[PDB]
């Protein structure tokens, strides 16, 4: 018939240069599960917890490593509804691209248009911003790339960077640690080791996920390929 | 040669224009003298030629959007930039095959890189140029400006050359008209002459 | 650049390949049937500086359909920090002419340009449907299509040096111009280099 | 004949009016275009249980007409007070949805008969698709005006107290010309009476001409 | 400019055309490829107005591209049928695309032939264009009851080098794509046999027509 | 414009068909199918042309699809029906395409509608039709007697199928004929790449 | 139940911590107080049986209704706040209509108790509207699905019916119904069957005297809801005061 | 409830204004800076980004500086999140305005456009104003050079070189001290760009990482936007050292 | 858990809290525990089993929508867990969608394509107080076309992933343990063992048990890929099977 309700300004700036309730938000991501991304730069993995702690995890297409196109592929920390969205959102915007250019959406490009969505929903009364942040993969330029889009709207350039359970702690030790000129082989070991040290508890092939993104394409790791790579290094 | 006739020579410190003043209905010229030339202001001069009728329409939107420039600012618009802007917007018009085609004869002043004028066709063509004339009136007189006067020739000259012009048209032309009017421009404003 | 006809505009355009440079060569006048407006006016455009885009028939849909290009050109020319490269723009141009229904653009795109801050040349016509084309031959194009382009295969090589292209080219809008009717009315010839483009004015009327 | 962008037709439909009760006469033959479609086909709808719907004209555009006059029963009964119509009120309405649909270029004659006797008011109504509509005491149209209606209008004017017997002998006339002279039907009907407290209509029956038209 | 055709070995579909792309009826690109890849494993054949074709091709490339992610199971040519079937319908003609849409779709293998307006018929050998005729001759000859990959490669070869023969704007190149459930094959040349040439010869006139007077180098 | 036809046994119908899907005055396509999917239960007997029956075939598709899960899984024919009769509401003369419907809904019984280009809905005993059924008209009447037993309606309908193809000249190759229950549709093919042939004239 | 006036009920989006709003809790509360409205689903139909207040000799059938014919073959009996009850009645009689048009047959009351359940919780979810303050049931005789009997509450669940009764005592009128075997009956010995339930167990403290006015979709109205026969209205009223003594 | 509620925003409060709107500003104090500053024959846009990190990849130049159109360029003061949806409307407007006009869009007239829809919200929609307060540069022939401000408030202001972001009060009296009316070129106004960035930020040390510079210069008929690459802006952070003792002597 | 503090207007509206919770959404779980549902999950290789219980207040009922077995789609099906007036109305918006996804994909739809489309719906609820989530729970169940039978659950929120075996209602965590068990043990995957390892977990978790009438097992087996339920009888067969196994 018709709906109201809360159509009034629900977001009060804070002097921080962010406004209050999507600081909030933040800590939603960082409660969120583990997620861990490094440019390898000869590629760009990224890995993600595959559990969300039930540990009944029967994974065949039902990943948080999804492909979106041909060499761009999202991982994600925090709410699911919020993901699915941007999953959807993001294959039209790539395709979008893939129209007028032939090519799909450049990593700086498909994150201004995500971006003006979550902050559409702060803004706005009776909506709530997404509690979602994305690393965004992609080979463009001829190098790959790794951004950071946070459940705010802003963004913040990251060569590697960590989400989930202990993030904070996650970028300084990345900011020091991150690795270039890295063999395919390689990228998985570093990504592996990466996430042990963000995500606690068992790993073994159906507590995590990883999707590597290079110059053949975007695709997602069998679940057996995680396993040797997790063995292998300390 | 495309529709009703206007014609304009700037010689860059003078502009020499004069149109016809008839918009007419059946045989009789219902007024003597009809305006075909508007001021937006007393240093932009816009003379609309075409259709009786649309000529009209077309320069009132445009009009008020070009004074809202003039609101905000409280200083001159580009009004070189003006004169095409609407003419962008008639592009957009063209595809559609309803005649709403102007040829149109913008005189302006601008402030900083100087005096501009701006020449339409009826399929829509901006030039900055020496001397042009819409429709039969600029087959009229195009051919015989290279010959006769140059690009800075003398106001009595040109006045002079104009007054045959309008007699040829009177002489020759299946469209004469008995009134036309005659307007001078100095480097800057405009002053009316003596009516031919 | 045409392939509708006017006879409220029309013009014409012959490109010819080098390896490393790409020549346009172009008319200067501008007609419309027993109608002129200048003795000399730009027709191609830089819009990201040193490539080009020209626009033919009429002054308004030539000026029209290449801030219109610049539309979209500019959300990659931010995004990416390099300039947009000759694939990018390609398909872009083409997109323009796509957003119509049934009747389409009306100036129908051929563009010239190098690939930015690198020198792999590039040509390419487009038709005024969204038909995509990939050409790296040689295009002509206009109205009279067959006639820019039968010239501008002949002239050159897939490397002659620039100076020779150039020379070609100035020839080239001659023999052409006594194949029209009568338009004319000044001569521009483009050599796209590397970071530079010529122009170059020829003598006449 | 008469009927502008027609394809199933229903030919012919007899309505005259007697003191309380109609007898409607219309084929079961129901020609998709020349060919007989469908042998047997009962034209009668239930508008309601006090109220009978029978047509003539193309039967694509009775199904269309069959819609509309449904919805409004619809209303009525809506209420809760549990009305049936009136036979003027639905017939009307509809009219003039018959003058907005001419603009669009399907046409429409269609021709419906409304008798119905509701709420206390007797109606004896015909509907068109060019919305000529009014009571009456005899009316039919289409390809029922061309043929049959004259005759039954030129013995209903000094004898305007024909009775449903007198009529029946002549529906049975009528239709011999119809099996005959139309190009739509051979014959067959559907024998409808409506009232105005129950809706009457015995199944589609054979009926098959008499010949002496090969004399001279 | 485009003349498509398909033969079934008792798989999914080798799609054949000979190559050249149009500038209306005069050669813009001697051969480059005109038989498309959509996102990774569909492959559109084209015939009639070549235009249409790649214009609904493409949005369906963007539709197909959202199943394939989440399921990771075969590009779904009826989703891809139902997007085309959709838009033609509505004005009753708009464009005329005549379209070879071919992939092995989930559960079993789906070939579709989109015309001018709608259809949602499931043929498994179909040849477009106006010579539809000339491709399903060579077809007919070649193919009795059951065909191999291989097989299915000789007579696509020679559907291709009928259009070439039969309407000149198609020439050169025999492009064979072959489109599977994951094996998806774009390579140009497959057979040459002719191909378009510069001369060996060269005349030009260089300065005895050339006329100049004017230079200036801006960026 | 190949035939449709329906013949009634009294629990589910059997319909036969002749195959072309033509491109115009050349036919692009006889390898196809004359019952698509147009649910995953119902079936319509489908010829003519090949957008004609189309529009409508979809859109009873989405409306049947509503009413199949919400009912309990079997739809109505009378409902079916009726949504093809609106695309052919606007398309009045535009479109010749008229399409054979048959089915068992939970109405009850067996029930045979005739879904016409018009606009119209009826539930009848058999019809066949097309824009060819003008051509085939006296055959499918002499086979149609009252309550025409299955195993006679497998040598009728098929019959009428190959006497459409060999006189059609909108007709061709191949029978696909489709008996339809309550279990599924189900398509067979009666070949004609073998030679059978209604006898020559002299 | 849970409710309080303070908190959780201010807008009418507003989700209450228990889980189910208060607001369709105070919905539920005054069908609870409002008289008892049965209908009784048979063999060959469907027998509705609503009381009709009467407040004064001066009220004519129009006054204070609780049987609507939501089509002209199927039924709607209310109980509850009537005004709430009769604007429902308009949309539904509205939803109907859209569908016969479409449609063209005999609706299923199966699909028609999806649509409104969900349209009910609808009302709930929104700001601009509140929810429904009535419990009511759909009853009808199609030939397409039979007979049919639904009843949807004001929280938006459909659940299908033999036999309900709301009133004031929901549950007394539920295993009365149980005892007796409905498929013993036809159509014509349920008309008695509902008609004494209604007397029992309604308790006056707000009516002074009631008229049953009962409504048949069944046998001898032919698949449309038309009022009860008069044979059979006469059949139905001896039994009910039988029923008492 | 919401009857119950104060935010105050299409409401006016005791003030005679909306807390919305005064509350903008606060946010824009604590978050990068950026300024515009006036040469004799370009214009330059000079911005910190709103990334303290120490590790930044580059996947996108434009952080604070978008360069919208060929005759134009930004800057954001604020918060990124409403910037993106600033920065998509303006690459339209400012092609719009292009295609009719077929002239430099004048930097006023832009400003005054946009400053419509900041207020727009504030007084009706029931949405708040915009976190930013984007800083144009822009040339037109009849102004000439030019440096717009906007403001969350509707506020527009011609300006000659101004800064707004963090530590704003400062910074415009320190360009105003190195650089009077008309004075400085554009090569030397680029390194009293990066001058001011240093002293003013949220978080210090000032790197080729934390910066972005951007040049509106005229080419040879041609206006010629350009970020510069970090390589460039790193040759003038070097020229900032020299600048400092310029300003004092 | 949290309640929340305020430094928007969070108390009655879903916008964040400094857990990150949605207010709305978590008063969508005490939802389920209004209706009283509680469903277990199995996946195997044979078939995609869920069981749930059926609601009975009187004995007067038609089987039709008091079920809670929905056909989503004719091969893929699934349950509604939790209040039953919240399932109906999503049920009601799932089908018009299913519906959709009919005319654009053409045919029958992969159960992780099934699931997603719900889930960004979904996501338009969860973001809103507008219109208050849909405090019910679905277990998306069928045979995916190549990779097998697959057990999904969907929240309120709309949050799906894949399982070895879910659960849903009143508690999902002291279900899913006790299913856990029951997937370490991994039965050879037939008709009757994972139907019968479904029916043993939903009466362990309760200590209530019950007759086979009582509850409604819906599969979709490798034998016809269409969504069906067993029935009284052929849930029974399992159930005396059951009694001999130990």
């Not at chain 9, 091969?75 to 867990?81: A, D, S």
């Amino acid at each position: 018939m018709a709906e109201r309700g809360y159509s009034f300004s629900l977001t009060t700036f804070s002097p921080s240069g962010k406004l209050v309730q999507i600081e909030y938000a933040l800590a939603a991501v960082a409660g969120g599960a583990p997620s861990v991304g490094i440019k390898a730069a000869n590629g760009v993995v990224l890995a993600t917890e595959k559990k969300q702690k039930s540990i009944l995890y029967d994974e065949r297409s039902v990943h948080k490593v999804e492909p979106i196109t041909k060499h761009i592929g999202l991982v994600y920390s925090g709410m699911g509804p919020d993901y699915r969205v941007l999953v959807h959102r993001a294959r039209k915007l790539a395709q979008q691209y893939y129209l007028v250019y032939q090519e799909p959406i450049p990593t700086a490009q498909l994150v201004q248009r995500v971006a003006s969505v979550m902050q559409e929903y702060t803004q706005s009364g009776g909506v709530r911003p997404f509690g979602v942040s994305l690393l965004i993969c992609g080979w463009n330029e001829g190098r790959p790339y790794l951004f950071q889009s946070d459940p705010s709207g802003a963004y913040f350039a990251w060569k590697a960077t960590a989400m989930g359970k202990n993030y904070v702690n996650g970028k300084t030790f990345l900011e020091k640690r991150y690795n270039e000129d890295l063999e395919l082989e390689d990228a998985i070991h570093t990504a592996i080791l990466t996430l042990k040290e963000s995500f606690e508890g068992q790993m073994t092939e159906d507590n995590i996920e990883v999707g590597i993104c290079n110059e053949a394409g975007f695709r997602r790791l069998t679940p057996t390929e995680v396993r040797d790579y997790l063995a292998a290094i300390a | 040669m495309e529709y009703l006739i206007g014609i304009q020579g700037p010689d860059y410190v003078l502009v020499a224009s004069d149109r016809v003043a008839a918009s007419n209905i059946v045989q009789m010229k219902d007024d003597h003298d009809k305006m075909f030339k508007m001021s937006e202001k007393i240093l932009l001069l816009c003379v609309g030629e075409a259709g009786d009728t649309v000529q009209f329409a077309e320069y009132i939107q445009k009009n008020v959007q070009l004074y809202k420039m003039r609101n905000g600012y409280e200083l001159s618009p580009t009004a070189a930039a003006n004169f095409t802007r609407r003419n962008l917007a008639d592009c957009l018009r063209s595809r559609t095959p309803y005649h709403v085609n102007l040829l149109l004869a913008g005189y302006d002043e601008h402030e900083g890189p100087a005096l501009y004028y701006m020449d339409y066709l009826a399929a829509l063509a901006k030039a900055p140029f020496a001397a042009h004339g819409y429709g039969a009136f600029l087959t009229l007189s195009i051919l015989d400006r290279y010959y006769t006067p140059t690009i800075s020739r003398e106001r009595a000259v040109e006045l002079l050359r104009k007054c045959l012009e309008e007699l040829q048209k009177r002489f020759i032309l299946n469209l004469p008209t008995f009134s036309v009017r005659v307007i001078d421009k100095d480097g800057i404003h405009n002053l009316e002459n003596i009516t031919f | 650049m045409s392939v509708m006809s006017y006879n409220g505009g029309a013009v014409m355009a012959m490109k010819g390949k080098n390896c490393v440079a790409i020549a346009a060569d172009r008319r200067f006048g501008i007609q419309a049937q027993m109608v002129t407006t200048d003795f000399q006016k730009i027709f191609p455009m830089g819009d990201r500086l040193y490539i080009g885009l020209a626009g033919l028939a009429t002054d308004v849909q030539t000026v029209a359909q290449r801030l219109k290009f610049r539309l979209n050109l500019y959300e990659l020319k931010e995004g990416r920090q390099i300039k947009p490269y000759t694939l990018m723009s390609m398909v872009a141009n083409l997109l323009y002419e796509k957003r119509f229904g049934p009747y389409y653009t009306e100036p129908v795109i051929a563009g010239l340009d190098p690939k930015t801050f690198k020198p792999f040349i590039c040509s390419l016509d487009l038709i005024g449907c969204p038909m995509v084309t990939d050409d790296f031959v040689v295009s002509g194009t206009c109205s009279e299509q067959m006639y820019g382009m039968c010239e501008s295969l002949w002239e050159p090589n897939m490397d002659p040096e620039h100076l020779f292209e150039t020379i070609s080219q100035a020839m080239l809008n001659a023999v052409d111009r006594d194949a029209v009717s009568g338009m004319g009315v000044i001569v521009h010839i483009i050599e796209k280099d590397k970071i530079t483009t010529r122009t170059l004015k020829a003598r006449m009327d | 004949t008469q009927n502008p962008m027609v394809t199933g037709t229903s030919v012919l439909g007899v309505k005259f009016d007697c003191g309380v009760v109609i007898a409607a006469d219309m084929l079961g033959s129901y020609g998709s275009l020349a060919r007989f479609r469908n042998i047997s086909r009962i034209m009668r709808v239930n508008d309601s249980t006090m109220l009978g719907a029978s047509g003539d004209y193309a039967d694509f555009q009775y199904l269309k007409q069959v819609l509309g006059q449904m919805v409004i029963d619809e209303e009525l009964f809506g209420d809760g007070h549990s009305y049936s119509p009136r036979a003027i009120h639905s017939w009307l309405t509809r009219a003039m949805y018959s003058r907005r649909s001419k603009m669009n270029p399907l046409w429409n004659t269609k021709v419906i008969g409304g008798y119905a006797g509701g709420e206390s008011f007797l109606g004896y109504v015909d509907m068109l698709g060019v919305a000529y509509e009014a009571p009456s005491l005899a009316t039919g149209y289409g390809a029922y005006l061309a043929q049959p209606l004259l005759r039954e209008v030129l013995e209903k004017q000094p004898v305007l107290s024909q009775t449903e017997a007198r009529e029946l002998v002549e529906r049975c006339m009528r239709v011999l010309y119809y099996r005959d002279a139309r190009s739509y039907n051979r014959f067959q009907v559907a024998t409808v009476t409506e009232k105005g407290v129950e809706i009457e209509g015995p199944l589609s029956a054979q009926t098959n001409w008499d010949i002496a038209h090969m004399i001279s | 400019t485009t003349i498509a055709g398909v033969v079934y070995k008792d798989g999914i579909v080798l799609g054949a055309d000979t190559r050249a792309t149009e500038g209306m009826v005069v050669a813009d690109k001697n051969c480059s490829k005109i038989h498309f890849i959509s996102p990774n494993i569909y492959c559109c054949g084209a015939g009639t107005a070549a235009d249409t074709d790649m214009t609904t091709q493409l949005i369906s490339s963007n539709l197909e591209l959202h199943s394939l992610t989440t399921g990771r199971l075969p590009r779904v040519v009826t989703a891809n049928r139902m997007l085309k079937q959709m838009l033609f319908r509505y004005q009753g003609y708009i464009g005329a695309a005549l379209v070879l849409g071919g992939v092995d779709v989930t559960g079993p293998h789906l070939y579709s032939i989109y015309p001018h307006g709608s259809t949602d018929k499931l043929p498994y050998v179909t040849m477009g264009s106006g010579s539809l005729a000339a491709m399903a001759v060579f077809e007919d000859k070649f193919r009795p009851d059951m065909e191999e990959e291989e097989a299915k490669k000789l007579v696509s070869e020679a559907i291709a080098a009928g259009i070439f023969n039969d309407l000149g704007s198609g020439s050169n190149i025999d492009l064979c794509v072959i489109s599977k459930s994951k094996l998806d094959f774009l390579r140009p040349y497959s057979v040459p046999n002719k191909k378009g040439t510069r001369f060996g010869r060269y005349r030009c006139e260089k300065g005895t027509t050339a006329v100049l007077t004017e230079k200036v180098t801006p960026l | 414009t190949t035939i449709m036809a329906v013949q009634f046994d009294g629990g589910v119908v059997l319909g036969a068909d002749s195959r072309t899907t033509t491109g115009s005055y050349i036919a692009n396509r006889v390898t196809d199918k004359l019952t698509p999917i147009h649910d995953h239960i119902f079936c319509c007997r489908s010829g003519s042309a090949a957008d004609t029956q189309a529009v409508a075939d979809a859109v009873t598709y989405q409306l049947g699809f509503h009413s199949i899960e919400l009912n309990e899984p079997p739809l109505v024919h009378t409902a079916a029906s009726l949504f093809k009769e609106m695309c052919y509401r606007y398309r009045e003369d535009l479109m010749a395409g008229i399409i054979i419907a048959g089915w068992d809904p939970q109405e009850g019984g067996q029930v045979y509608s005739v879904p016409m280009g018009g606009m119209m809905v009826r539930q009848s005993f058999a019809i066949g039709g097309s824009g060819s059924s003008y051509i085939y008209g006296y055959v499918d009447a002499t086979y149609r007697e009252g309550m025409t037993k299955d195993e006679c309606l497998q040598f009728t309908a098929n019959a009428l199928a190959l006497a459409m193809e060999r006189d059609g000249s909108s007709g061709g190759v191949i029978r696909l004929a489709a008996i339809q229950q309550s279990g599924v549709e189900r398509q067979v093919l009666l070949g004609d790449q073998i030679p059978k042939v209604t006898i020559s004239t002299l | 139940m849970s409710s309080i006036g303070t908190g959780y009920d201010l807008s009418a989006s507003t989700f209450s911590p228990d889980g189910r709003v208060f607001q369709v809790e105070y919905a539920m509360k005054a069908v609870e107080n409002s008289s008892t409205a049965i209908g009784i689903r048979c063999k060959d139909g469907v027998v509705f049986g609503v009381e009709k207040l009467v407040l004064s000799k001066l009220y004519e059938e129009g006054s204070n209704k609780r049987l609507f014919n939501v089509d002209r073959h199927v039924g709607m009996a209310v109980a509850g706040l009537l005004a709430d009850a009769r604007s429902l009645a308009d949309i539904a009689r509205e939803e109907a209509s859209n569908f016969r048009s479409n449609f063209g047959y005999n609706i299923p009351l199966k699909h028609l108790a999806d649509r409104v359940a969900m349209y009910v919780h609808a009302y709930t979810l929104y700001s601009a509207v509140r929810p429904f303050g009535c419990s009511f049931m759909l009853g009808s005789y199609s030939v397409n699905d039979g007979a049919q009997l639904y009843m949807i509450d004001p929280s938006g669940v459909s659940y299908g019916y033999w036999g309900c009764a709301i009133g004031k005592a929901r549950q007394a009128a539920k295993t009365e119904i149980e005892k007796l075997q409905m498929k013993e009956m036809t159509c014509r010995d349920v008309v008695k069957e509902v008609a004494k339930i209604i007397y029992i167990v309604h308790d006056e403290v707000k009516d002074k005297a009631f008229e049953l006015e009962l409504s048949w979709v069944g046998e001898l109205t032919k698949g449309r809801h038309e009022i009860v026969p008069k044979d059979v209205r006469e059949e139905a009223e001896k039994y009910a005061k039988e029923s008492l003594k | 409830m919401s009857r119950r509620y104060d935010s105050r925003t299409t409401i006016f409060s005791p003030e005679g204004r909306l807390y919305q709107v005064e509350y903008a500003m606060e946010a824009i104090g604590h978050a990068g800076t950026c300024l515009g500053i006036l040469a004799n024959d370009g214009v330059l846009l000079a911005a910190e980004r709103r990334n303290i990190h120490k590790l930044l990849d580059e996947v996108f130049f434009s952080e604070k500086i978008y360069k919208l159109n060929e005759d134009m360029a930004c800057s954001v003061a604020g918060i990124t999140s409403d910037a993106n949806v600033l920065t998509n409307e303006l690459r339209l407007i400012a092609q719009r305005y292009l295609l009719q006009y077929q002239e430099p869009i004048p930097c006023e007239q832009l400003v005054t456009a946009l400053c419509d829809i900041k207020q727009a919200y504030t007084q009706f929609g029931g949405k708040r104003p915009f976190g930013v307060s984007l800083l144009y540069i822009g040339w037109d022939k009849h102004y000439g050079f030019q440096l717009y401000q906007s403001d969350p408030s509707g506020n527009y202001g011609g300006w000659k070189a101004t800064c707004i972001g963090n530590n704003s009060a400062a910074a415009v009296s320190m360009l105003k001290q190195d650089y009077k009316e008309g004075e400085m070129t554009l090569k030397s106004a680029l390194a009293l760009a990066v001058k001011v960035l240093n002293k003013t930020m949220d978080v210090s040390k000032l790197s080729a990482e934390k910066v972005e510079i951007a040049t509106l210069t005229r080419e040879n008929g041609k206006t010629v936007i350009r970020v510069l690459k970090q390589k460039e802006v790193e040759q003038l952070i070097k020229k900032h050292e020299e600048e400092e003792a310029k300003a004092e002597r | 858990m949290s309640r929340g503090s305020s430094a928007g207007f969070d108390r009655h509206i879903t916008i964040f809290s400094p857990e990150g919770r949605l207010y709305q959404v978590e008063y969508a779980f005490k939802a389920i525990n209004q209706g009283g549902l509680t469903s277990v999950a199995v996946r195997g290789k044979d078939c995609a089993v869920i069981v749930t219980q059926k609601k009975v207040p009187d004995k007067l009922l038609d089987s039709s929508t008091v079920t809670h077995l929905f056909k989503i789609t004719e091969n893929i099906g699934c349950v509604m867990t939790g209040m039953t007036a919240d399932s109906r109305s999503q049920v009601q918006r799932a089908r018009y969608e299913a519906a959709n996804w009919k005319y654009k994909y053409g045919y029958e739809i992969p159960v992780d394509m099934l699931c997603k489309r719900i889930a960004d719906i979904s996501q338009v609820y969860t973001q809103n107080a507008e219109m208050r989530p849909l405090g019910c729970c679905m277990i998306l169940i069928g045979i995916d076309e190549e990779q097998g039978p697959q057990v999904y659950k969907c929240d309120p929120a709309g949050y799906y992933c894949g399982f070895k075996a879910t659960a849903a209602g009143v508690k999902q965590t002291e279900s899913t343990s006790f299913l856990e068990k029951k997937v370490k043990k991994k039965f050879d995957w037939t008709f009757e063992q994972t139907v019968e390892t479904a029916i043993t977990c939903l009466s362990t978790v309760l200590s209530i048990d019950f007759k086979p009438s009582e509850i409604e097992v819906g599969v979709v087996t490798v034998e016809n890929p269409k969504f069906r339920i067993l029935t009284e009888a052929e849930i029974d067969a399992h159930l005396v099977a059951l009694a001999e196994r130990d």
